[model samples]
Target: MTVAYIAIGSNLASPLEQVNAALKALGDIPESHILTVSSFYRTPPLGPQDQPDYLNAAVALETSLAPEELLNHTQRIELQQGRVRERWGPRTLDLDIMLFGNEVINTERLTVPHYDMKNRGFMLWPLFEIAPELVFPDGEMLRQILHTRAFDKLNKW
Candidate 1:
């Protein structure tokens, strides 16, 4: 089984409720099990400024599926939960593959150790809560990333 970390966020229609439901759906994915989850946090939007604050959290899971298959499952879940495809737009749910085992993938459809993980407080903080010592394949530690930058801009919800 490969361990994968996923970042979850929602800013539309009872954000907290939507996230909780998504987490539940994640637990139901075949050949996978939710291992740990960080406390849900309220963070400022990472994209367009004209949107509500997002409720963000991170999840760790063990899965038997390949990376692309996992992405497909997540996308299906988002669609089931009424996610409208928009770049950085408001959504009922957003699930991003943050890391997949120790592998680095830069494909046309996905990027592991998500491209923005290092710079986003919402991503780093919640991930740190569950996997402080998690080192990327490139050797940058999650704990180190947490301290390397100022997270004052984030507000825990």
Candidate 2:
């Protein structure tokens, strides 16, 4: 089985609830097991300026599924949550495949270690919580990248 890390976020509804729902939904997919889920972090919207604050977290999983299959599963969970998009606009849920094993996969529909995982504080901080020594394929440490970023614990659940 391949161990993967997934970054999850939401800005609509009860984000903590949505995040937990997503964790459960991921396990609904075949060949996937949620190993650990990081604490949620809050952040101001990153792009497209005006939007609600976002709640984010990272999840570690053991899966035998391929990247594309995992992408499909994530999206399915989003759909079930009534997720809608306006092209990086506010969302009820957002799931990104942060890392897949030690594999580097860049595909049309997916990217491992997520294209922007390092740039976002919300994704980095919680990820480092549970996987302290996790290093990317490029040898970058999450805590090191998080030094300049800022995030907060807006809720406890």
Candidate 3:
């Protein structure tokens, strides 16, 4: 089995509750079982400033599924949660594959270690909570990254 980290975010309809529900749903995915989940965080929206704040968190899981299969499962979970997109607009549930073991992948549909994972404290801080010594395939340490100036403005909920 491979260890994977997933980022979770929700900004609509009891966002915190949605995040918790998504965590439960993740375990129901075939070949996947959630190992750890971070505390919920209320973070400012990343895109349009007009939307409600988001409840963000991260999950560490063991998955026997391949990366693409995992991505498909995550998307399926989002759809089941009523996800609707308006280009960075508010969401019902958002599940992103932040890291898949030590693999680095960039493709038309998915990016492992997520394209912006290092820069977003909403993802990093919570991730650090569960995996303090996690280092990316590119050799960046998550704990160290969490202390950088890029995350200075981020705060816990």
Candidate 4:
């Protein structure tokens, strides 16, 4: 059994709707169950300021799927949600695997602990809401990220 943390965000094509639909699809992945979901948040875009603010959220999943297999399912969901990979470029739906159990992974296709998560408030807050006691596989407490990172106050939805 493994608990996977997925970051869900969107800034186009009816974001809230796409996010909820993606949640359903995520739960449908073979050998996975929806463990918990965090509150939706509205946040400014990271890469390009010209795009609309994104709807951000996170989900905890209890699953038996290997990390890569789970990644395949998420990308499939992204396509089904009408992601063309550019919006000039705001995303339709972006599903990123933030963690997979206590597994620390680095591969040509994936990076666990998501490389940039600690610096992104949109990712960390929702995650903390779902698992306040979480400690990274690196032994970093979730709140520790809150203490150290520079982020604007989040607007919860």
TM-scores for all candidates: the values are 0.95, 0.88, 0.94, 0.95
Worst 10 residues of 2 by lDDT: 148-157
Instruction: Give me the runs in candidate 4 sitting further than 4 Å from their true place.
Output: 86-88
Candidate 1 per-residue lDDT over residues 69-97, each given as its tens digit: 99999999999999875578899999999
lDDT rank order: 4, 1, 3, 2
Model with the higher lDDT, candidate 1 or 3: 1
Give the distance in Å from residue 54's predicted Cα in candidate 4 to where it truly belongs: 0.3
- Candidate 4: which pairs clash? none
Select the stronger candidate by lDDT from 1 and 4. Answer: 4
The per-prediction tally of clashing pairs is 0, 1, 0, 0
Error in Å for residue 2 of model 1: 1.3
The residue-by-residue lDDT of candidate 2 on 43-134, one tens digit each, is 77888778888888888999999889888888888899988656689888888888998899877787787897777767777778879888
What lDDT is reached at residue 38 by model 4? 95
lDDT of 4 by residue, 39-123 (tens): 9999988877998999999999999999999999999999999987333379889999999988999997999979888888899
Better candidate by lDDT, 3 or 4: 4
Candidate 3 residue-wise lDDT, 68-119, digit = tens: 9999999998998998655788988999999999999989898887997777
Q: Which window of ten consecutive residues has the lowest lDDT sum in model 3?
A: 148-157
Off by over 4 Å in 2: 148-157
| Best-fitting candidate, scored by lDDT | 4
Cα deviation at 67, candidate 1, in Å, is 0.7
The TM-score that candidate 4 achieves is 0.95
Clash pairs, candidate 3, are none
